[PDB]
Design a protein around this ligand. Structure first.
Ligand SMILES: *[C@](O)(C(=O)N1CCC1)[C@H](CN1CCCC1=O)NC(=O)[C@@H]1[C@@H]2[C@H](CN1C(=O)[C@@H](NC(=O)C(F)(F)F)C(C)(C)C)C2(C)C
Ligand SMILES: *[C@](O)(C(=O)N1CCC1)[C@H](CN1CCCC1=O)NC(=O)[C@@H]1[C@@H]2[C@H](CN1C(=O)[C@@H](NC(=O)C(F)(F)F)C(C)(C)C)C2(C)C
Ligand SMILES: [Cl-]
Lengths: 306, 306
């Protein structure tokens, strides 16, 4: 019993982190096989980052201008190309600790663990959600760029995020591992702001299922609703529309608790209209939307990783 | 910027987890050098756990009755002794991945990461606090016993907890790595309940400092108080007494923000007496007490681990 924000074990990803320096800019890289991936603004100075021409900055660099270190050991660079907003450095050494891995572009609503790194060294690990507005609510200081987000499936690391920047309001924006930003952001120091966020409805329901499973049941009402009516009521509270796909994905939790999704939807409708009136759910005074149905099942049924 | 519940990177500890089976009971062990540590109720059946005599159960076991596996590989046991509530299995192999480590008994108020494990495999990682009443608010299913809690300092893992049991209300209780329980708990299936908890005052203040650092300042008032007056007011809200040691430990955050501890204490006194009136701090509607001063600094200044 118990329900916690839980990150994936970070060890497979720890073994991949390196420090990348170019000129006087240092940030983190990901060393998979004989390639190091990092944000392309490693090639900038402070000044440059106000409005950089990356293609131009990169033409003036040679392999030797990039210093890659894995602990004590310097890796010798033997190639470089830019792909979108990421830089690929080919190195003379394959990483012996390369885990089985993939590069995924996740969807808004999906969660992942971030391994926050400074100078190629791990600081800590925490769980995030890709927000509807394509930001994450992270914890990132100067030096954290090139920190990565990932999911583990059995033995395979799916890398889905690399950290680039912070926006007003202290939210965070980044790219997939092919260097495409999530959302409409660009890697320059100019005024940019995140769209208005919305609440990830399917995740809130997953969390309510987790609460029932943990014996917190006070909010269960005796009603049903339809998907139509629920969505009209949720729309005014800035909840995303719940689709039939969402309903189907919540099927396992539904079957496991013997509570139909639309009866839980009835319960959430009531909580949105009446508030929690001094009560908590799973220790929280606010509804939580950063647990996916998968995260709930994984946690409440004990799924592990080799 | 940003502030998150952040676990230590789990990789050094991942490399130490094994599965231990005895009879038909399987749980997790910690493999350091040529010793495996696990909860001693691995030697019980279901029936036994209602009221076990461990010394008697262990006399009837030989080395070969314990099956220890590290992935595919079985480790051959060549010795066993019991120390308090933990079992030490000497094995024919030293763990090549043994990190630098220590065994620590932490104090109430201190935090640590838990690496939740099933069948010797890591499920996930999260940050906990040892409560005043000597429980933790974990997430532990059947199979999780022998999961460990730890702190990392630079390159050294301080192991401080091994998971044994769950108490009514879904809190968790366990031992240091010498097999002494935290709190008055015993490793038998009998009615036991946790003392009434209290709020870890020094941690709440640390968290308020973290909030100022992140620019959430609305609750800062213009008053001071004395340590005496603050403690009388905090006592009625089931806050622990703040000592002078607590004040001194909060010195770095105090100096870094230019807010004296007793002025923050003035601010917290007000929050306790007036509530948060619809407002959040660092995204939370409730005051948080599971961040130590160290955790705040570590997070808000970027401390890393080799
Ligand atoms: C990252 O570049 C890094 O860690 N580096 C080591 C030296 C470079 C850094 C990480 N940071 C800094 C504090 C919060 C965070 O995530 N990222 C950057 O500095 C971004 C780089 C520049 C400007 N960056 C920003 O995040 C800025 N944001 C904006 O301009 C915004 F309004 F678009 F969001 C900043 C927070 C500095 C105002 C580039 C290439 C985008
Ligand atoms: C742990 O033994 C385990 O995972 N095992 C694999 C087979 C043994 C198990 C972990 N659990 C189970 C669910 C929550 C949790 O932390 N721990 C135990 O079952 C405990 C073992 C028995 C009884 N245990 C309990 O946690 C029980 N608690 C109590 O009796 C209490 F009231 F004291 F807390 C239980 C939750 C099963 C009622 C021993 C040796 C204490
Ligand atoms: Cl909350």
């Amino acid at each position: 019993s118990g329900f916690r924000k839980m990150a994936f074990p970070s060890g497979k990803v720890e073994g991949c982190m390196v420090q990348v320096t170019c000129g006087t800019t240092t940030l983190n890289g990901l060393w998979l096989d004989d390639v190091v991936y990092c944000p392309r603004h490693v090639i900038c100075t402070s000044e440059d980052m106000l409005n950089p021409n990356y293609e131009d900055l990169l033409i003036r660099k040679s392999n030797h201008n990039f210093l890659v270190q894995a602990g004590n050991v310097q890796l010798r660079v033997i190639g470089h190309s830019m792909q979108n907003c990421v830089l690929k450095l080919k190195v003379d050494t394959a990483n012996p600790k390369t885990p089985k891995y993939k590069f995924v572009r996740i969807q808004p609503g999906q969660t992942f663990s971030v391994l926050a790194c400074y100078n190629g060294s791990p600081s800590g690990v925490y769980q995030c959600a890709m927000r509807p507005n394509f930001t994450i609510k992270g914890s990132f200081l100067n030096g954290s760029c090139g920190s990565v987000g990932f999911n583990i499936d059995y033995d395979c690391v799916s890398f889905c995020y690399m950290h680039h920047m912070e926006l007003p309001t202290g939210v965070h924006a980044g790219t997939d591992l092919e260097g495409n930003f999530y959302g409409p952001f660009v890697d320059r120091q100019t005024a940019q702001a995140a769209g208005t966020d919305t609440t990830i409805t399917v995740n809130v329901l997953a969390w309510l299922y987790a609460a029932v499973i943990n014996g917190d049941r006070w909010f269960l009402n005796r009603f049903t609703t339809t998907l139509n009516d629920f969505n009209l009521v949720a729309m005014k509270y800035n909840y995303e529309p719940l689709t039939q796909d969402h309903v189907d994905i919540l099927g396992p939790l539904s079957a496991q608790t013997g509570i139909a999704v639309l009866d839980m939807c009835a319960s959430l409708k009531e909580l949105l209209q009446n508030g929690m009136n001094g009560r908590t759910i799973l220790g929280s005074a606010l509804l939580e939307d950063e647990f996916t149905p998968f995260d709930v099942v994984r946690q409440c049924s004990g799924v592990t990783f080799q």
